[PDB]
């Protein structure tokens with residue numbers, strides 16, 4: 001399925017994603033996917049976009065991902081949407 005190795009991937013977020021990350025404390029320009037996933041996860045919970053569907057129709061997350069919603073259990077799909085907003089190091 002999804003390898004644990006993916007969490008070690010080094011990435012450089014594009015401007016829009018970087019802006020979202022910085023709203024939950026992100027201080028850097030290069031991150032590990034583990035960091036990106038956590039910061040996104042915290043952005044999601046603190047904004048009560050989730051409580052298995054995440055609703056992001058009127059949130060920058062929705063513009064970032066290109067969807068009005070998505071399931072938190074569909075990890076492969078989530079990884080794809082995230083990569084649309086970053087560059088691998």
Ligand SMILES: CC[C@@H](c1cccc(C2CC2)n1)N1C(=O)[C@@](C)(CC(=O)O)C[C@H](c2cccc(Cl)c2)[C@H]1c1ccc(Cl)cc1
Pocket residue numbers: 037038039040041042044045050072073074075076078079
């Ligand atoms: C929506 C809450 C959030 C969440 C909240 C707080 C901390 C974390 C840390 C795991 C990063 N995640 N979260 C979860 O709570 C999980 C358990 C949902 C699940 O499968 O039941 C896992 C989920 C995840 C983890 C790793 C890779 C992918 Cl693609 C998805 C993860 C998540 C979901 C969506 C995004 Cl965009 C980013 C991270």
